[PDB]
Amino acid sequence: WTATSGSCKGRCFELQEVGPPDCRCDNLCKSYSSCCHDFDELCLKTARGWECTKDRCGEVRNEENACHCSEDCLSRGDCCTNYQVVCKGESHWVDDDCEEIKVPECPAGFVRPPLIIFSVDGFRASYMKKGSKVMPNIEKLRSCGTHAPYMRPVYPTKTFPNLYTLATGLYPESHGIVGNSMYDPVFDASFHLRGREKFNHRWWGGQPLWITATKQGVRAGTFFWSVSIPHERRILTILQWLSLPDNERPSVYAFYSEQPDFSGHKYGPFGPEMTNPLREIDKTVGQLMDGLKQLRLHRCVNVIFVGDHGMEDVTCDRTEFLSNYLTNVDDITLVPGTLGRIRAKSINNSKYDPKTIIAALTCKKPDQHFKPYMKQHLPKRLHYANNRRIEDIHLLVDRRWHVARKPLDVYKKCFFQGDHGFDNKVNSMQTVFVGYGPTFKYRTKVPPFENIELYNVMCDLLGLKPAPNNGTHGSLNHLLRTNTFRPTMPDEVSRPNYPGIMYLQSEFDLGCTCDDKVENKLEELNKRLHTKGSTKERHLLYGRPAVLYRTSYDILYHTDFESGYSEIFLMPLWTSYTISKQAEVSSIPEHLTNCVRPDVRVSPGFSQNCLAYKNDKQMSYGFLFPPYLSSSPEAKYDAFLVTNMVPMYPAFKRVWAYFQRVLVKKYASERNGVNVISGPIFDYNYDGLRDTEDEIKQYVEGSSIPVPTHYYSIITSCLDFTQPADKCDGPLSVSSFILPHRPDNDESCNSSEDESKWVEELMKMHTARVRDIEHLTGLDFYRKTSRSYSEILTLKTYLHTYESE
Ligand SMILES: *[C@@H]1O[C@H](CO)[C@@H](O[C@@H]2O[C@H](CO)[C@@H](O[C@@H]3O[C@H](CO[C@H]4O[C@H](CO)[C@@H](O)[C@H](O[C@H]5O[C@H](CO)[C@@H](O)[C@H](O)[C@@H]5O[C@H]5O[C@H](CO)[C@@H](O)[C@H](O)[C@@H]5O)[C@@H]4O)[C@@H](O)[C@H](O[C@H]4O[C@H](CO)[C@@H](O)[C@H](O)[C@@H]4O[C@H]4O[C@H](CO)[C@@H](O)[C@H](O)[C@@H]4O)[C@@H]3O)[C@H](O)[C@H]2NC(C)=O)[C@H](O)[C@H]1NC(C)=O
Ligand SMILES: CCCc1c(OC[C@@H](O)COc2ccc3c(=O)cc(C(=O)O)oc3c2CCC)ccc(C(C)=O)c1O
Ligand SMILES: [Ca+2]
Ligand SMILES: [Cl-]
Ligand SMILES: [K+]
Ligand SMILES: [Zn+2]
């Protein structure tokens, strides 16, 4: 119950919301059906529209009007935004030449440049070029300020998960808004776009920017706007708040537009009906900038123009129906659309079985347009698993398609032509970023980056310490003229041992054999030198990775590769080697097919054993440094050391062998040499973070050899490919992957074909950032380069996406 008999007189769009059942006058009261009786009359005036006209200039103030053209409006802070243009002969901001904003030019009483975030729903990255003729204000912000060609949203590429990621710097699995619809089984509560449950604070985790600001004594405008407040009024409200006394005035504001997403769903992303929505958003930007210019703040405020996600062509005839696959369709609940999430309809149904659901959905139809996954098997770059609100079964839907439970769901819920939510590497889902202001650079293009990085920068713009988040703070310093954040590299926690030869061959009883009894004073000195690190500079190009947790490990040197070998996990944490453009691929010799060799530097008690692999009928082994790429017949023996072996299912060895035999050389040819760092990852609790030894769910049978959930590689080369990877004087280029270590290849529907038809496609799906591998391993890479640390942080956040341009 709300006592709406109270009044909004002198309270319109008040910043703090008042306590029920007292009636409200803030920008959210409509959504709660709780505004005072006179909120429309007082706070949503529309009389005479939004624009001054010649005849209104110097009018007698009429408090009924939506906005004012009377002489006193500039001191009241409520002129129509075009007041000075119409009445005082000023120019629109868009018609003024771009002039660099070298320092903030602010009115007295401004303690810091305010931040205004202008967020637009469904604003696809390619609109910046494709719509540029009809968006002159947005085009000026973009050309004059700092802009990226696009900004990568988070998955799923839905509205609330992405806007809340902008607010928090967190992945949706961490902030809790994991879709536009959700069931939380602990709460036993459902979140929906429509209605009231979504306002309950227990959905919204982390700490959004407006709370970060408030806790640190920086005041904030509200970021939510009730949908029925027109945009012109949202702009006038922000401009009014900017005229508050210094002690009352917020420093951060957010405007939101439901367009162009609203029309994109109806008309598709490039429907001819889309030009008008884009012109209308441009006009709104123009209102803001003219209004800032009136207030003399257009060279004071930092403006962010940012979108949540793009928009794809999706029509009802491109719908896959689970009723075409599952016998049991009424025993499941599906969250449908551009992604699928499945759970049991009833928790009391003992016949429900996820394994049989997955199998029935796996590669059943030739052009099948979705792929099922247990959530722990989804590409790690999505970071979409570690939340109870995310159903164990997930469907990754192809761009341009929907998935639904039954045909009747599509016509008893087809005029819609656009949608979004797909994999956040899809080109159509990319969205926009422009920053304009004294704190941003002038006429500067920056590379694409992920929206999870923006919170930290917004905190930097406001002089706030960010709450703990998933951005990499410093990775976007290149967007800024000032206020950069200058991080120090993390300190190394464990230092390595450097073992020499300490064990005789007969101390090892590992059940291994190798045909290696096959032999000089020229050659003997050189082998000792290699084992002491004499080639290390060739193979370890960016320093040893630092281990950021407490553990016991050894550095092992070899002619062709260097490794950091964990005594705890019995295998390398990392294996680093360089392959020049000229390197030759060789085979594993017939006499060496099953060769595994004790490492006389590492005790038997800290080694793997071959007998565990013979006994484990499901598990085989591979090597981290590939024997195919040995520099010489003699150096090849090093590749079969028990310290270079790792556990691999046979089905995974098909992937791994193709990568090592064919792809590494192909990348070295293409990129003019590569440096490779490969290793295992253990993330049995799918939290994106390195497991401790006690979290490991599976071991090679009979042994203490832990089985990795994934295998990674980081492939680095020179950005200027005229220079070889090992002699690069400038910026680097990287691509990386985190391949799932699975016992079948059911994810790849073409896997019965030759590896050349499916393996690289698998690897591309599981592309990763170096930062993702760092979280998963507790390793810190690139510690010794010639590059600035901020540039290296940007390199670590890079994702090679494989989409066209
Ligand atoms: C992306 O960035 C984020 C932010 O930095 C990273 O997330 C952090 O990860 C940390 C490790 O996973 C984690 O630290 C834990 O915090 C526990 C206290 O948590 C509460 O308080 C904080 C602070 O305000 C709050 O933010 C938390 O918010 C979560 O939960 C609420 C309510 O459920 C949600 O609204 C919110 O969305 C958020 O949910 C997300 O995180 C939780 C985990 O906290 C997940 O369960 C959800 O699925 C969702 O992802 C909390 O309200 C603290 O109690 C933990 O300490 C225990 O475990 C450690 C193990 O190291 C041990 O040292 C301790 O002894 C202790 O053990 C005891 O409890 C165990 C578990 O019950 C039990 O098994 C033991 O036997 C012991 O009794 C732990 O320190 C931190 O909370 C999150 N923060 C956030 C905001 O998500 C994230 O890792 C980054 N991602 C990547 C890939 O880098
Ligand atoms: C979502 C987090 C907050 C946030 C931002 O929210 C802006 C906020 O007005 C968006 O709210 C929306 C958006 C769509 C719909 C609907 O389609 C339907 C319905 C309904 O039927 O009720 O309600 C909606 C609401 C709720 C109106 C209270 C914007 C930008 C940011 C940034 C930049 O951080 C940010 O954090
Ligand atoms: Ca983990
Ligand atoms: Cl959803
Ligand atoms: K085996
Ligand atoms: Zn939408």
| Burial grade of 26 (CB within 10 A; 0-12, 13-18, 19 or more) | buried
What span, in angstroms and rounded, lies between the C-alpha atoms of 619 and 621? 7
**Which ligand 1 atom is nearest residue 174's CA?**
50
Per-position b or e across 578-611, b if 16+ CB within 10 A of its CB: bbbbebebeebeeebeebbbbbbbbeeebbbbbe
Q: What's at 562, amino acid-wise?
A: E
CATH of domain 505-797: 3.40.570.10
Active-site annotation holds for 159: yes
- Would you say how long the chain is, in residues? 805
Structure tokens at 791: 């540039």
* Sheet containing 732-740: order of strands: 553-557, 562-566, 571-579, 674-681, 710-718, 732-740, 767-768
Among candidate residues 330, 328, 216, 311, the one with its CA nearest the CA of residue 268: 311
Contact criterion met (CB below 8 Å) for 400 and 417: no
Backbone angles phi, psi at 196, to 5 degrees: -105, -25
229 lines ligand 2 (CB under 6 A): no
* The token pair that represents 771 in the structure block: 């930062």
Element (H, E) at 279: helix 275-294
Tell me the CA–centroid distance for residue 771 and ligand 3, in Å. Answer: 15
Tokens of 663: 């792809």
Residue type, 288: L
- Tokens coding 293: 């210019």
DSSP string, 739-777: EE--SS-TT-TTTTS-GGGTHHHHHHHTEE-HHHHHHHH
* Sequence-ordered strand ranges (E) for 548-673: 553-557, 562-566, 571-579, 620-623, 645-648
SS3 per-residue string spanning 147-179: ECCCEECCCCCCHHHHHHHHHHCCCHHHHCCCC
Cα 199 to ligand 3 centre (Å): 31
DSSP state of 727: G
- What the block records as the tokens of 23 is 């009636």
3-state helix/strand/coil string of 306-345: EECCCCEECCCCCEEEHHHCCCCHHHEEEECECEEEEEEC
Query: How is 672-696 classified by DSSP, letter by letter?
Result: TSEEEEEEEE--TT-SSSPPPGGG-
3-state helix, strand, coil in the chain (%, to 5): 30, 20, 50
716 Rama sector, left if φ>0, alpha if ψ -120 to 50, beta otherwise = beta
Long-range Cβ pairs for the range 327-332 (8 Å, 24+): 327/360, 328/357, 329/405, 329/406, 332/357, 332/405
How remote is the CA of residue 207 from the centroid of ligand 2, in Å? 17
Query: Ligand 4 center to residue 549 CA distance, Å?
Result: 37
* CB atoms inside a 10 Å sphere around CB 154: 27
User: Which of 118, 154, 204, 225, when mutated, tests ligand 2's pocket best, judged by the most ligand atoms within 8 Å of its CB?
Assistant: 225
* CB-based contact 512:597 (threshold 8 Å): yes
Q: Best substitution site from 17, 31, 34, 163 to test ligand 2's pocket, by max atoms within 8 Å of Cβ? A: 163
* CA–CA separation, 91 and 99 (whole Å): 15
Question: Which strand (E) or helix (H) includes residue 43?
Answer: helix 39-43
Q: What letter does residue 661 receive in the DSSP assignment?
A: I
The bound ligand whose nearest atom lies closest to the alpha carbon of 775 is 1
Question: Any binding-site annotation on 392?
Answer: no
Reported as type and span, the H/E element at residue 547 is: strand 546-547
| 8-state DSSP, 42 | H
Q: How many Å separate Cα 132 from the centre of its chain?
A: 27
Q: What is the DSSP string of 333-397?
A: EEE-BSEEEEEES-TT-TT--HHHHHHHTSS-STT-SEEEEEGGGS-GGG---SSTTS-SEEEEE
Give the orientation angle of helix 770-777 with respect to helix 789-797, to 10 degrees: 90
Q: Tell me which H or E stretch contains 649.
A: none
In DSSP terms, 307 is beta-bridged to 120
- Which structure tokens are listed for 203? 């959905």
Question: Is 758:750 a contact under the CB 8 Å cutoff?
Answer: yes
Q: How far is the CA of 491 from the centre of ligand 1 (A)?
A: 23
Torsion, Cα of 73, 76, 78, 83 (10° steps): 20
Residue 420 assigned as binding residue: yes
The method of structure determination was X-ray
Asked if residue 180 belongs to a known ligand binding site, the reply is yes
> 689 a known binding residue?
yes
- Measured in whole angstroms, how far is the alpha carbon of residue 213 from the centre of its chain? 23
For residue 163 and ligand 2, the question of a CB distance below 6 A is answered with yes
Determine whether the annotation assigns residue 159 to a binding site: yes
- Mark 346-366 as b/e (b = at least 16 C-beta within 10 Å): eeeeeebebeebbeebbeeee
Mutation pick for ligand 2 pocket among 154, 160, 224, 451 (CB with most ligand atoms within 8 Å) = 224
Residues with CB under 5 A from ligand 4 (ion): 179-181
Check: CB of residue 643 under 8 Å from CB of residue 556: yes
Residue nearest to atom 92 of ligand 1 (CA): 688
- Can you tell me the distance from the alpha carbon of 695 to that of 677, in angstroms, rounded to the nearest whole number? 24
| Strand (E) or helix (H) holding 798 | none
For residue 228, with 0-12 CB atoms within 10 Å meaning exposed, 13-18 middle and 19 or more buried, which class applies? exposed
Using CA atoms, how far residue 487 sits from 491, 579, 674, 792, in Å, is 12, 32, 28, 11
Residue 174 CA: which ligand is closest? Answer: 1
- What does R_g of the chain's alpha carbons equal in angstroms? 30
Find the Cα–Cα–Cα–Cα dihedral 592, 595, 599, 604, rounded to 10°: -170
Q: Which are the contacts of 775, defined by CB distance < 8 A and separation ≥ 6?
A: 688, 689, 690
**Per the residue annotation, which of 4, 146, 157, 159 is the catalytic one?**
159
- The resolution, in angstroms to one decimal, equals 1.7
For the chain, give me the number of helices (H) and strands (E)? Answer: 22, 29
Residue that has been written with the tokens 């803001």 in this structure: 288
Spatial separation of the C-alpha atoms in residues 498 and 562, rounded to whole Å: 12
The answer to whether 602 touches 568, Cβ cutoff 8 Å, is no
Verify whether ligand 2 is closer than 6 Å to residue 223 (CB atom): yes
Q: Specify which residues 339 forms β-bridges with.
A: 396
Is it true that the peptide bond before 487 is cis, omega within 30 degrees of 0?
A: no
Q: Indicate whether residue 193 lines ligand 2 (CB < 6 A).
A: yes
Q: Which atom of ligand 1 is nearest to the CA of 775?
A: 94
Bond from prior residue into 156 cis (ω within 30 degrees of 0): yes
Q: Residue 684's beta-bridge partner residues?
A: none
CB < 8 Å & 24+ apart, contacts of 136-141: 136/94, 136/282, 136/286, 137/93, 137/94, 137/282, 137/283, 137/285, 137/286, 137/289, 138/281, 138/282, 138/285, 138/305, 138/434, 140/93, 140/94, 140/98, 141/285, 141/303, 141/305, 141/434, 141/436
